[PDB]
Design an enzyme around this catalytic site. Structure first.
Site, mmCIF file in Angstrom:
data_model
loop_
_atom_site.group_PDB
_atom_site.id
_atom_site.type_symbol
_atom_site.label_atom_id
_atom_site.label_comp_id
_atom_site.label_asym_id
_atom_site.label_seq_id
_atom_site.Cartn_x
_atom_site.Cartn_y
_atom_site.Cartn_z
ATOM 1 N N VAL A 8 0.831 -1.195 0.000
ATOM 2 C CA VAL A 8 0.000 0.000 0.000
ATOM 3 C C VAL A 8 0.864 1.243 0.000
ATOM 4 C CG1 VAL A 8 -1.987 1.022 1.076
ATOM 5 C CG2 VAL A 8 -1.659 -1.394 1.262
ATOM 6 N N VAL A 65 -3.957 5.744 7.432
ATOM 7 C CA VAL A 65 -4.830 4.715 6.800
ATOM 8 C C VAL A 65 -4.348 3.331 7.234
ATOM 9 C CG1 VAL A 65 -5.978 5.678 4.761
ATOM 10 C CG2 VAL A 65 -3.489 5.418 4.777
ATOM 11 N N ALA A 66 -3.297 3.279 8.052
ATOM 12 C CA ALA A 66 -2.748 1.984 8.512
ATOM 13 C C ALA A 66 -3.450 1.561 9.802
ATOM 14 C CB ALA A 66 -1.271 2.118 8.738
ATOM 15 N N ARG A 67 -2.996 2.091 10.939
ATOM 16 C CA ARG A 67 -3.631 1.761 12.241
ATOM 17 C C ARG A 67 -3.617 2.998 13.130
ATOM 18 N NH1 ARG A 67 -1.567 -3.283 10.473
ATOM 19 N NH2 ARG A 67 -1.257 -1.126 9.777
ATOM 20 N N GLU A 115 -12.314 1.811 17.454
ATOM 21 C CA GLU A 115 -13.438 1.770 16.525
ATOM 22 C C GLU A 115 -14.618 1.062 17.177
ATOM 23 O OE1 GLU A 115 -10.245 0.824 14.997
ATOM 24 O OE2 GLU A 115 -10.277 1.432 12.886
ATOM 25 N N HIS A 149 -12.905 3.696 9.106
ATOM 26 C CA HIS A 149 -12.157 2.519 8.699
ATOM 27 C C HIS A 149 -12.777 1.929 7.428
ATOM 28 C CE1 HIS A 149 -10.065 -1.501 9.948
ATOM 29 N NE2 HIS A 149 -9.453 -0.886 8.949
ATOM 30 N N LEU A 150 -12.723 2.750 6.380
ATOM 31 C CA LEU A 150 -13.293 2.471 5.073
ATOM 32 C C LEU A 150 -12.240 2.005 4.090
ATOM 33 C CD1 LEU A 150 -16.164 4.986 4.302
ATOM 34 C CD2 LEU A 150 -15.998 2.985 5.701
ATOM 35 N N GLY A 151 -11.003 1.824 4.555
ATOM 36 C CA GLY A 151 -9.868 1.726 3.648
ATOM 37 C C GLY A 151 -10.027 0.684 2.560
ATOM 38 N N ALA A 152 -10.619 -0.462 2.897
ATOM 39 C CA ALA A 152 -10.816 -1.522 1.923
ATOM 40 C C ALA A 152 -12.272 -1.672 1.525
ATOM 41 C CB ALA A 152 -10.284 -2.841 2.460
#
Lengths: 305, 305
Positions: A152, A230-232, A261, A280-283
């Site tokens: 990523v 966007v990781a943690r 979350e 937490h929409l990243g994927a």
């Protein structure tokens, strides 16, 4: 030959239809640690996404039937990964599908941050027409710093150099050749902090990375720097970013992941003016959803054979 | 040698200080057409952005003192070029400095719409944690159609292919060599409509383009197309765009320009759920602001020589 695959968490009907062609598929969804322990003794493979905690007790309880655990997605934090193979259970994941759509989402966070797409759209839907309040920055020539040059992290870079940025990265485990071959200089950790106009976080949350972006890191940075996580979450010191935005060290912040979350319903970053938060929409792109399904699908099935 | 330049609309102080090195500068901001007709007879040069009407009556009123009109920004819609030319008067503009921060913003509208950055951020801030409502779409391999292959048009294509999209364009006045030289096929109008997963609009507003995006247009398009307008509103039949979003033909729409700015307080596009709206922020980057000031400044000064 009727192999048995327990699918603990929702899965893309594209893949469920591949598994159903090569196994028995149990889709009991969200079981209490005890339900699962009772089932796993009768499963040749388990597939989980994130909520299921494939702990040591889960391997212990299977009694050696469980061969392969399939982690749908990128991370594997939740599979006790050392028990897994101690009991002789392979563990395979679904990284490449979610990886694309996760850098895709970082870039979407960076650009929308930079122009205030989010605040402005809210301002105008609320009747206000405040053209001067929402003037953004450019991206061309801006130095973007990537912490943790994963798939990523490097897929992001490729997109950010397409937007015409200068893109640098720091990660002691990164092939100088691969980096130089997409046009990314590998740089020091103090060079990345200082010289960047934009900083994204693509690091795993280990003891060495926890609360990393704390008050010392924000001092080293350039003023007017913008940051995208966007990781943690919690790899940022949340209270410390609240103070750097309140001062104007960090100009604005784009946050997909959080230390918690759902975050607190008063939690100050989520509520802050210069922050662009997504849950937490990243994927969360239909394409990855269906491609992650098909990936562990083909992954589990190829282990099992 | 004291020249006299009337700057009608705000101008980045970079530009103003360049102009005050080579002329007398009157910054009378916002005059009534009569006050401007009065002044323009005492002015060798008139610099305007977007609001001041350089009509025909202005060219008449000046008696021939006016030598150059400077259009701070991209287009020249407000300047009666026909009359300026007629009265022996040069027109100059600031095309390139805005051009980029336009395309830049256009892209940001695209990526923020694809991933619901706007809708999601406002939900989280509103306490709602709704992770599933806001699933986005992948950009990669999608077909971005650019209607109008201007400087901003191609400039968006560049950023788009760097996000990894399949970019086609339709503008009959576009060099097929420039197109192929940046990797953009030039295609028919019905092809742009039918093949596209994304459509941005960079078209200036003629009686040919007025309300071009109409019910007939939307039927031709691929279902679930997403439309990004950054050029001029009106080219889109607002009523019909709304009825195409409510019917699901158009997936979602990211609109920077409107048919009336500020739009009506009840306006269904502005308030619509699937629409991301910004208040004509296209050129509102700090770089493109200071950069356009210095552009017309140089452009006016050079003419004035």
């Amino acid at each position: 030959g009727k192999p048995t695959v327990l699918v603990a968490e929702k899965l893309g009907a594209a893949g469920l239809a591949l598994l159903r062609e090569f196994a028995n598929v149990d889709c009991s969804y969200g079981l209490s640690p005890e339900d699962l322990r009772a089932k796993i003794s009768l499963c040749d493979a388990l597939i989980v996404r994130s909520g299921t905690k494939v702990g040591r007790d889960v391997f212990e309880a299977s009694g050696g039937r469980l061969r392969v655990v399939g982690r749908a997605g990128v991370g594997i934090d939740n599979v006790d990964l050392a028990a897994a193979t101690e009991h002789g259970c392979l563990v395979v994941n679904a990284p490449t599908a979610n990886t694309v759509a996760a850098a895709e989402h970082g870039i979407a966070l960076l650009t929308a941050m930079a122009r205030n797409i989010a605040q402005a759209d809210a301002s105008l839907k609320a009747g206000k027409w405040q053209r001067n309040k929402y003037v953004g920055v450019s991206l061309v020539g801006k130095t973007l710093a990537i912490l943790g040059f994963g798939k990523v992290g490097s897929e992001v870079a490729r997109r950010a150099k397409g937007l015409g940025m200068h893109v640098i990265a720091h990660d002691p485990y990164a092939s100088a050749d691969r980096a130089r071959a997409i046009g990314v200089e590998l740089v020091s950790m103090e060079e990345a902090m200082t010289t960047a106009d934009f900083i994204l976080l693509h690091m795993p949350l280990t003891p060495a990375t926890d609360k990393m972006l704390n008050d010392e890191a924000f001092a080293k940075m350039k003023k007017g720097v913008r940051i995208i996580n966007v990781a943690r979450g919690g790899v940022i010191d949340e209270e410390a970013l609240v103070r750097a935005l309140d001062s104007g060290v960090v100009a604005q912040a784009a946050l997909d992941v959080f230390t918690k979350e759902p975050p607190a319903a008063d939690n100050k970053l989520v509520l802050h003016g210069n922050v662009t938060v997504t849950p937490h929409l990243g994927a969360s792109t239909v394409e990855a959803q269906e491609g992650v399904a098909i990936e562990i699908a083909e992954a589990v099935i190829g282990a099992l054979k």
